[PDB]
Design a protein around this ligand. Structure first.
Ligand code: NA
Ligand SMILES: [Zn+2]
Ligand SMILES: [Zn+2]
Ligand SMILES: [Zn+2]
Ligand SMILES: [Zn+2]
Ligand SMILES: [Zn+2]
Ligand SMILES: [Zn+2]
Ligand SMILES: [Zn+2]
Length: 75
């Protein structure tokens, strides 16, 4: 599912257990993502879902929920 794929992307990049990858979890504050991690997460979401996340939209991707909601509507 879309959610499962999003979890694997995040788990692979941040090394966090999927059980902690919840909708309200902030990549930085809750999942420990640093600046490079965030850039790589965006790059991965684009590659895996075949879409583009313009800089503007990328800035709004702060939680797991943002990515899921964004992708569900866009793809
Ligand atoms: Na993986
Ligand atoms: Zn891989
Ligand atoms: Zn697990
Ligand atoms: Zn923040
Ligand atoms: Zn928090
Ligand atoms: Zn891009
Ligand atoms: Zn947009
Ligand atoms: Zn948000």
């Amino acid at each position: 599912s879309l959610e499962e794929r999003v979890k694997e992307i995040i788990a692979e990049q941040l090394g966090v257990e999927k059980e902690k990858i919840t909708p309200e979890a902030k990549f930085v504050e809750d999942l420990g993502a640093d600046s490079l991690d965030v850039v790589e997460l965006i790059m991965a979401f684009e590659e895996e879902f075949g879409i583009e996340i313009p800089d503007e939209d990328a800035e709004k991707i702060q939680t797991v929920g943002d990515v899921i909601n964004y992708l569900k509507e866009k793809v």
